[PDB]
Design a protein around this nucleic acid. Structure first.
Lengths: 380, 183, 184, 196, 110
RNA sequence: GAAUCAUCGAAUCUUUGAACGCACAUUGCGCCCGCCGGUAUUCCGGCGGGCAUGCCUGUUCGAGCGUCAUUU
RNA sequence: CUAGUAACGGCGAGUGAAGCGGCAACAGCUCAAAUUUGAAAGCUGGCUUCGGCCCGCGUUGUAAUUUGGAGAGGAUGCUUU
C-alpha cells in the first residue's frame, strides 16, 4: 500500500511544455527555436493536455521528453556557448581599439558574411536526421524549392550577397548534374512560377522556380528563420551534390571562370569534367532564344534534354553561339513579341513546355506566333 | 623603486596622509567579515618583503583579532592567533607569513600570506616548492612562522639559553639521568 | 552642443573645396578620356556634412540626396564636368552586364504621380510609358547596356536605387563593380 | 522599506565618506584631474606609440627568423610599470608622466606628483587606470610615461608638454597644498546645526 | 616544426567527404511522424488553363472583397496569352513562411 | 597442473563509520541522467552513474550612478 | 667534563646554567630592497596528429642578474661547458 500522486505520475512525465523545455535547456527563445529547425525537433500533440498540465491552454505547445534530452546533449549547444564567448571576444578588440586583434578574432569566428559557408558544422546532425540517401532526396523537395526562391530574392542582413552568390553557384551545379544525367522529366508552367519534376534513383523531386522579376518582401517576415533554413539546406545541398558527382564520376567541385561569370555566362561558365526518350528529343537541333524569352528557365530544360547547339542574345548572357540572327544554322527561334527568314522556324516558348511534357513534337503550325495559344495541361 | 618610497611611508604611520588611510580602511574592514579575503595586499611593500608574489597560488587574507588580556596574559601573540584562524579556514593552504595592517580600540588587523601547495606554478618553482613538502603542514600551529620563532625565543646568545633549541627539549636534556656502562 | 573642434574643421574643408571648385572652372574642364560616349553607374557616398551651392543644384539634378543611392548616367563633354565637380561625394565606374541586370531585378522602382512603387507588372510598364518603343523590363535592360535616344526618359522613369549599406566590403575603374557585389 | 545588499551599501557609503571627510593634500590633489580636450590630445599622441601586442610581436620575430634563413633602429613605446616609470623619472629620462586617479592602494602613486615636480618632469593626472591599461594592452596601468618619440612628432610632444604645463599644472598650483573636504549637503548641515 | 612567414594578404588568398561512408539500414521508430508533403500541382494552377476552368468576373470581384485567410483556395486561375504577360506571384514568400510555421510550429497528428 | 601451498604487480569489495542528497532505532524518504522486465509514450517494480561542507586555480553567469570611454 | 661552579633564594629545605676544552657529524644557501626597458624574455589551463594552437595570470611586477666578510657596470685576457 503506497500513495502515488496523479500530478507527478502519468502524461506529465512524458510530455513537457515549451516554457519548461526552454528553462531546462537554459537557452534563449531564438536559440531554442533555431536548434529545433536544425535537429528536426517537433512539438507534436499529447493525448490529454490537461493530464500533461492541469494549468494549460490549447494555444500552448508541448514537447516530448526524448528529443529535449537530445538537445541537452547536443554538441551544437556546446558550440553555442563557445560562439557566444567568442562573440564577446570580438567586441573586446573593438572596445580596446585593437584593429589587428579584431581582424584575427573575426577570422577565428569564421563569420558567414565574409565566407558564405555556414557558421556551424552540422555533418553529424544531418547524418542522424537522414538515415538514407533516399530520405535526403525526399527532403530535397523543399530544399531546392527553398534554394531557388531565396536565390531570386535580394540580399539582407541575414542573407548577404556572398551567400546568394554561393547559392546560385551551387544551384547551377545541381542543374549541371541534371543536364548531364538527363534526369528532368516534367516541366510545368504556373502563375506562381515554373514547376519541375525529375527522377533520381527511383525518387521524384519537385521544386518551383519563380519568374525573374521583382517580388515584394515587406510585411511581417523573420529573416533569421529563413536564414537558418537556408543554412541547414545549404549544408544538406553540398554533401548531396558531392555524393551525386562522385556517383556519376564527375569531379566535385567543378571548375569555373570568374571572368565568364562576371561577363554573364551563368550556365556557360561552369565546365564539367567527366573524369577526376529525353536524349532523342532534340537530338540534333539548334535553338536560339530571343531577348524576350526567359533564358535561365529555358536553358535548364533543353540542356537537360540534350540539345546540342543553343544561342541567345548578347545582352541576355555570355559564352554561347553566335549572337546575330542572320546565321542559317538555327532551325527553331523562340520569339514572343506582339528577319522573317524562310530557313528559320518562328515558334513560341509555350510550344517548348508543351513539347517537353508530351514528348510527341507538338506542331509549330498550331503554336505559330500571332495566334491564340492552345490550353496547355498539367502533367501531374 | 616605488617600494622604497612605500617603506619610508610605512615607517611614518602616524602622519597625516597615512593616518587618514588607516582611519578609512579600519571603518571598511570593520563592516566586512572577520576572515575575509583580499584581492591585493593593502601594504604591497610589506607583502613583497615577506615573500608574496603576483603568482597563481598566492592569496591574501585579512583577519580581525580581539585585543586585550586573557590579570592573566595569553602567551600567544595576536599575530599567532590570527595565523591559526586562517589555517583553520583555508585548510588546503600553507601559512607563509603575516603582517600588521591596521589597529583600533577593540581590534587588530592582520594580513596573512597563503601558498597553495597543490597548484602547478608552486610545485614548478624551486624557491617555493619547499612548502609543498609534508613537514610544513600547518606551520602556524607549531610556532614555525616569524611570530612563533619570536615567542619561542629562537635566538642565539647567553640571553636566550633556555629556549634556543626548545625549552621542553632543553628541560628534558637537563633533567635526564645519564648512566653509562663502565661507571 | 558642438565644439570649436568642428568649426575649424568645417571651415577648413570648405576653403579646400572652394579652391578646388574654383580651380576647376578656372582651368579647362577636360578629362583624359576618349571622346566616344560611354555609360557610368554612379553612387553617392557621404563625403562631408556641409555642402557647397554649385553641387547643391546638381545633386538635386541627379536626385541623389539620400544615403547610398545609385543611378545610371551617360557621359558627354557636359556630363563629364557634372561628374568632374561632384567627385568627393560620388563614385564613378563602368558597369558590367551581370551587375546591371541583377540590380534592377533585385531592386526595381518606378515613378508615377510622385510615388515610389515597385516593378510588379510589365503591364504597369505599358501603363506608365507605353508609346516610347519599350515593351517590357528587358527592353529597358537592353536600353541600359546600349544607350539609345529614349534613355533620357528611362533614366527619368527609374527611381534611384536605395542599396544596402556594406559592413566593410577618386576614380575606380573595376572596384565599384566590386562595390555593387559587396553591398547589393 | 527595502534592504540593499551589503557590498552595494559599503561601496556607496565609501562615496559619501570620501566627499565628506577632509582629505590631506597628498590625496586631495588626485581629485583634480585634467579636462576632456587635453585627455584626447594626450591619447592621440600616446596611441601612436602603443606597444606591440603578443600577436604582432610573434609575427615580427617570425619575420627576422625566416629572413635569416634566406638594420633596425631603437623602438619607441610608451613606458609603463610603477618601478620602471619611477626609475625613469628618478633618472630624468621621462618627458611626460600620466598618473591614474583610482589606484586602490593609493600609496603606490601618492608620492608620484611630488617626485615628478622635484625632478622637473611635467606630469598630469587622468581618469581611469583602465584607460591607461588600454594603451598598454594590459587590464590596468597605474602610470605611463613618454621618454623619447620619433622625429616625425618631436613638435607634437613639445606642444603637449606645454599644454599640460599651462593648462593643468599652473591651474592646480594652489590646490596642491590645500586640503580636501567641504562638500556638505543640506542633510549634513542640518545635522551639524542640531549637534552644535 | 614551424611554417615560415607568409604576408597577411597572401594568407587571405589561402582563406568535401562522404557522409554515408559506412551506411547500414536503420529501422524507423514508430513515434516519429514524417511531415506530409505538398500536393502535386493541379490542372487549375496553370497560367493557361482550359476555358471551362474560368470563373467569371463576379466571383473575382467577390474574391477581392472578402478578407485573406478566409479562403478555401488561396488562388483562382487566370488567363494570360503570353509568358511575358504573366507577373510574379504576390504572396509567394508569405506562403513559404507560412509553410515554415507549418513545418516547425503547427503539430502533426498520426 | 593438485594444494586449508607459497608469492603477489590484476580484480571483486554488503551496511556503517571523518561519513558525504534527507532521515536513521526503518534494509525508509527526494531530485538529475540512462537501462531492463511485466498489459506499456502514460502504470508498477528493479538496476547503473550522480547530488555534503570550507578553501585554491580556472570556466561561465549575474549585480552595483563604484567607475572609465563614447559628436568624427 | 665544565659543575653541583657562577648565579638566585622562609640563604633552611633548596634551586641551578653557560663560554672555553676533548670528541661524534659537518654543507651551505634563497629572497626584498636595481630599469629587461634595444622589445614579460616568465607561468596556470584545455585543444591536439602531439608538432604547437589559442584562453587566462601578470606591469599594483612573472623570468634573468645580485644577497654586505658581498655585489653590479665597463674594459681585459686566459680558463670552463
Amino acid at each position: 500500500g503506497k500513495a502515488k500522486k496523479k500530478g507527478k505520475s502519468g502524461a506529465a512525465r512524458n510530455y513537457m511544455t515549451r516554457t519548461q523545455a526552454v528553462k531546462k535547456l537554459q537557452l534563449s527563445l531564438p536559440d531554442f527555436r533555431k536548434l529545433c529547425i536544425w535537429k528536426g525537433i517537433y512539438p507534436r500533440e499529447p493525448r490529454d493536455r490537461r493530464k500533461v498540465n492541469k494549468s494549460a491552454t490549447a494555444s500552448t505547445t508541448f514537447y516530448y521528453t526524448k528529443d529535449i534530452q537530445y538537445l541537452l546533449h547536443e554538441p551544437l549547444l556546446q558550440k553555442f556557448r563557445e560562439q557566444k564567448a567568442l562573440e564577446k571576444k570580438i567586441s573586446r578588440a573593438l572596445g580596446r581599439g585593437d584593429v589587428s586583434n579584431a581582424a584575427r578574432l573575426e577570422r577565428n569566428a569564421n563569420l558567414p558574411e565574409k565566407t558564405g559557408k555556414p557558421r556551424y558544422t552540422l555533418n553529424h546532425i544531418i547524418r542522424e536526421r537522414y538515415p538514407t540517401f533516399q530520405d535526403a532526396l525526399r527532403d530535397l523537395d523543399d530544399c531546392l524549392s527553398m534554394l531557388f526562391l531565396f536565390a531570386n530574392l535580394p540580399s539582407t542582413t541575414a542573407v548577404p550577397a556572398k551567400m546568394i552568390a554561393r547559392c546560385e553557384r551551387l544551384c547551377h551545379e545541381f542543374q549541371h548534374y541534371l543536364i548531364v544525367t538527363h534526369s528532368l522529366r516534367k516541366s510545368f508552367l504556373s502563375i506562381k512560377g515554373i514547376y519541375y519534376q525529375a527522377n533520381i534513383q527511383g525518387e521524384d523531386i519537385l521544386w518551383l522556380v519563380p519568374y525573374k522579376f521583382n517580388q515584394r518582401i515587406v510585411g511581417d517576415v523573420d529573416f533569421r528563420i529563413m536564414g537558418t533554413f537556408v543554412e541547414f539546406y545549404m549544408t544538406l545541398l553540398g554533401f548531396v551534390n558531392y555524393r551525386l558527382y562522385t556517383s556519376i564520376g564527375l569531379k566535385y567541385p567543378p571548375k569555373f571562370d570568374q571572368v565568364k561569370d562576371d561577363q554573364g555566362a551563368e550556365l556557360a561558365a561552369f565546365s564539367l569534367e567527366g573524369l577526376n526518350d529525353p536524349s532523342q528529343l532534340f537530338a540534333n537541333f539548334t535553338f536560339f532564344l530571343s531577348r524576350e524569352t526567359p533564358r535561365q528557365p529555358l536553358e535548364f530544360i533543353l540542356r537537360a534534354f540534350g540539345c546540342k547547339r543553343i544561342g541567345w542574345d548578347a545582352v541576355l548572357g555570355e559564352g554561347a553561339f553566335t549572337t546575330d540572327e542572320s546565321d542559317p544554322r538555327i532551325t527553331h527561334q523562340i520569339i514572343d513579341r506582339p528577319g522573317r527568314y524562310p530557313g528559320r522556324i518562328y515558334v513560341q516558348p509555350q510550344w517548348v513546355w508543351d513539347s517537353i511534357n508530351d514528348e510527341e513534337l507538338k506542331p509549330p503550325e498550331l503554336y505559330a506566333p500571332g495566334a491564340q495559344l492552345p490550353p496547355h495541361l498539367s502533367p501531374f | 623603486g616605488a617600494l622604497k618610497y612605500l617603506e619610508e611611508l610605512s615607517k611614518k604611520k602616524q602622519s597625516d596622509v597615512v593616518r587618514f588611510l588607516l582611519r578609512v580602511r579600519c571603518w571598511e574592514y570593520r563592516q566586512l567579515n572577520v576572515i575575509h579575503r583580499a584581492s591585493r595586499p593593502s601594504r604591497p611593500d610589506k607583502a613583497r618583503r615577506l615573500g608574496y608574489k603576483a603568482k597563481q597560488g598566492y592569496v591574501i587574507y585579512r583577519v580581525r583579532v580581539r585585543r586585550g588580556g586573557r590579570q592573566l596574559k595569553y602567551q600567544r601573540s595576536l599575530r599567532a592567533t590570527a595565523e591559526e584562524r586562517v589555517g583553520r579556514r583555508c585548510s588546503n593552504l600553507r601559512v607563509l607569513n603575516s603582517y600588521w595592517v591596521n589597529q583600533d580600540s577593540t581590534y587588530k588587523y592582520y594580513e596573512v600570506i597563503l601558498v597553495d601547495p597543490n597548484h602547478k606554478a608552486i610545485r614548478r618553482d624551486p624557491r617555493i616548492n619547499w612548502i609543498c613538502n609534508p613537514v610544513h603542514k600547518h606551520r602556524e600551529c607549531r610556532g614555525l612562522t616569524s611570530t612563533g620563532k619570536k615567542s619561542r625565543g629562537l635566538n642565539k646568545g647567553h640571553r636566550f639559553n633556555k629556549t634556543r633549541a626548545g625549552r621542553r627539549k632543553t628541560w628534558k636534556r637537563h633533567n635526564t639521568l645519564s648512566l653509562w656502562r663502565y661507571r | 552642443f558642438k565644439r570649436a573642434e568642428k568649426y575649424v574643421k568645417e571651415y577648413r574643408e570648405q576653403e579646400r573645396e572652394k579652391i578646388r571648385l574654383a580651380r576647376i572652372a578656372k582651368q579647362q574642364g577636360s578629362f583624359h578620356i576618349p571622346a566616344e560616349a560611354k555609360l557610368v553607374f554612379v553612387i553617392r557616398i557621404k563625403g562631408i556634412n556641409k555642402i557647397p551651392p554649385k553641387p547643391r543644384k546638381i545633386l538635386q539634378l541627379l536626385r541623389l540626396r539620400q544615403i547610398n543611392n545609385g543611378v545610371f548616367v551617360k557621359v558627354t563633354k557636359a556630363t563629364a564636368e557634372m561628374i568632374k565637380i561632384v567627385e568627393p561625394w560620388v563614385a564613378y565606374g563602368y558597369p558590367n552586364l551581370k551587375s546591371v541586370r541583377e540590380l534592377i531585378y533585385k531592386r526595381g522602382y518606378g515613378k508615377v504621380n510622385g510615388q515610389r512603387i515597385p516593378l510588379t507588372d510589365n503591364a504597369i510598364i505599358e501603363e506608365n510609358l507605353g508609346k516610347y518603343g519599350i515593351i517590357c523590363i528587358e527592353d529597358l535592360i537592353h536600353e541600359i547596356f546600349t544607350v539609345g535616344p529614349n534613355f533620357k526618359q528611362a533614366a527619368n522613369f527609374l527611381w534611384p536605387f536605395k542599396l544596402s549599406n556594406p559592413n566593410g566590403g577618386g576614380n575606380r575603374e573595376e572596384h565599384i563593380n566590386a562595390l555593387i557585389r559587396a553591398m547589393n | 522599506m527595502v534592504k540593499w545588499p551589503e557590498y552595494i551599501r559599503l561601496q556607496r557609503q565609501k562615496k559619501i565618506l570620501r566627499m565628506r571627510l577632509k582629505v590631506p593634500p597628498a590625496i586631495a590633489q588626485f581629485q583634480y584631474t585634467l579636462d576632456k580636450n587635453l585627455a584626447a590630445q594626450a591619447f592621440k599622441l600616446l596611441n601612436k606609440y602603443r606597444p606591440e601586442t603578443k600577436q604582432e610581436k610573434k609575427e615580427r620575430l617570425l619575420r627576422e627568423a625566416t629572413a635569416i634563413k634566406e638594420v633596425s633602429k631603437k623602438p619607441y613605446t610608451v613606458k609603463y610599470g610603477l618601478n620602471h616609470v619611477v626609475g625613469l623619472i628618478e633618472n630624468k629620462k621621462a618627458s611626460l608622466v600620466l598618473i591614474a586617479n583610482d589606484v586602490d592602494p593609493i600609496e603606490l602613486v601618492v608620492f608620484l606628483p611630488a617626485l615628478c615636480r622635484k625632478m622637473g618632469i611635467p606630469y598630469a593626472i587622468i581618469k581611469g587606470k583602465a584607460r591607461l591599461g588600454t594603451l598598454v594592452h594590459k587590464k590596468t596601468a597605474a602610470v605611463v610615461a613618454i621618454t623619447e618619440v620619433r622625429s616625425e612628432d618631436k613638435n607634437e610632444l613639445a606642444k603637449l608638454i606645454s599644454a599640460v604645463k599651462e593648462g593643468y599644472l599652473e591651474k592646480v598650483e594652489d590646490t596642491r597644498k590645500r586640503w580636501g573636504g567641504g562638500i556638505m549637503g543640506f542633510k549634513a548641515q542640518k545635522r551639524e546645526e542640531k549637534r552644535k | 616544426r614551424i611554417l615560415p612567414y607568409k604576408p597577411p594578404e597572401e594568407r587571405e588568398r589561402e582563406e568535401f567527404y562522404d557522409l554515408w561512408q559506412n551506411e547500414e539500414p536503420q529501422p524507423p521508430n514508430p513515434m516519429h511522424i514524417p511531415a506530409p508533403k505538398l500536393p502535386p500541382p493541379g490542372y487549375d494552377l496553370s497560367y493557361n488553363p482550359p476555358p471551362e476552368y474560368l470563373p467569371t468576373k463576379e466571383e473575382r470581384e467577390e474574391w477581392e472583397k472578402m478578407d485573406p485567410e478566409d479562403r478555401e483556395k488561396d488562388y483562382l486561375p487566370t488567363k494570360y496569352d503570353s509568358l511575358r504577360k504573366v507577373p510574379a506571384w504576390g504572396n509567394f514568400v508569405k506562403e513559404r513562411f507560412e509553410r515554415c510555421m507549418d513545418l516547425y510550429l503547427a503539430p502533426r497528428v498520426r
